[model samples]
Target chain A: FVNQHLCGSHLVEALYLVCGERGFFYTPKA
Target chain B: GIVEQCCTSICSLYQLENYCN
Candidate 1:
């Protein structure tokens, strides 16, 4: 889970494993 | 915000359902 504020915006993010679900997640600097 | 709270609740419910089933 991720919580962040960027340029006057509130953001929440999450990366989780679900049944039979798999992937790679990537993000660059805001 | 109310939206955030509702979304959180829904997400929790979903997780609970998935885990129990």
Candidate 2:
């Protein structure tokens, strides 16, 4: 899992990241 | 900064609630 500790909060934002380009679901290198 | 931390904590608590419920 990525580091969310120091990142901003917000569940939506967290999930947004999850679904974001760098997130697990849509990362470029994966 | 508080918003960010609160958000994370809320999400965590929300999930915990779901799990506990």
Candidate 3:
């Protein structure tokens, strides 16, 4: 029952996280 | 110079998705 959310949803959550990292990870430092 | 600030996510480095706000 809860396995879906814990496994399936978890997988999806991880995938969706990719979309969140669109560009907030490409800045220069000086 | 007009296509850089296009902040698509929140990372400050690269692939470092944890940088999202």
Candidate 4:
């Protein structure tokens, strides 16, 4: 699953694999 | 102004009104 996210000065196309019907997430760049 | 894979700050995607039943 995937969703759009906005945090501070970072804006982008985010993709993620979720294991539920609904939720929110974030990850720090490496 | 529109939803695009470009620019930073104030990025937005057009509202998708799907599943309107």
Candidate 5:
């Protein structure tokens, strides 16, 4: 599932797949 | 930031709620 992640740098939309990393993400709005 | 604590506390997935276009 993909969701908005609150990083120390910026807010990004992130997604994950089976046996995959948890941060397949991109930057969105502020 | 109460929910922020719970958000991070529970799971990294449930992070933010966006009201963007």
Candidate 6:
């Protein structure tokens, strides 16, 4: 599993995903 | 000045241990 956030030209992939925010379940809007 | 490209598993913004690639 990995947590990536638009490090460059590419985003990230994980075992699971949620909304684009920082919470119990989230993601970050690029 | 570096060997590897900067963006792979190198999550500096998060500032955590996942930086090991």
Task: Give me the candidate number with maximum DockQ.
Answer: 6
* Cα lDDT for residue A12, candidate 5: 35
- Cα RMSD, model 4: 10.1
**Highest TM-score scorer:** 3
Q: Give the whole-model CA lDDT for all candidates, comma-separated.
A: 0.27, 0.35, 0.31, 0.26, 0.32, 0.29
What TM-score do all the candidates reach, one by one?
A: 0.18, 0.23, 0.24, 0.20, 0.19, 0.15
Question: How good is the docking of model 1, as DockQ?
Answer: 0.06
Q: Model 5, range A1-30, lDDT digits (tens) per residue?
A: 333333433333222222143333333322
How far residue A27's Cα lies from its native spot in candidate 2, in Å, is 24
Give the distance in Å from residue A24's predicted Cα in candidate 6 to where it truly belongs: 30
The lDDT, on a scale of 0 to 1, for candidate 2 is 0.35
Tens digit per residue, CA lDDT, model 4, A1-30: 123444423332221112123332332331
Give per-residue lDDT, candidate 5, residue B14.
36
Stretches of model 6 off by over 4 angstroms after superposition: A1-8, A11-30, B1-6, B14-21
- State which docking tier applies to candidate 1: incorrect
Model 5: colliding residue pairs: none
lDDT of 5: 0.32
Query: Worst 10-residue stretch by lDDT in candidate 5 chain A?
Result: A10-19
Docking quality (DockQ) of candidate 4: 0.06
In Å, residue B13's CA in model 5 sits off its true spot by: 15
lDDT of 1 by residue, A1-30 (tens): 122221111112232332224432322231
Which digits, one per residue and each the tens of the lDDT, describe model 5 over residues B1-21?
413532243324333322222
Interface RMSD score of candidate 3? 13.4
Write model 2 residue lDDT over A1-30, tens digit each, in one string. Answer: 233342333333554544444432212121
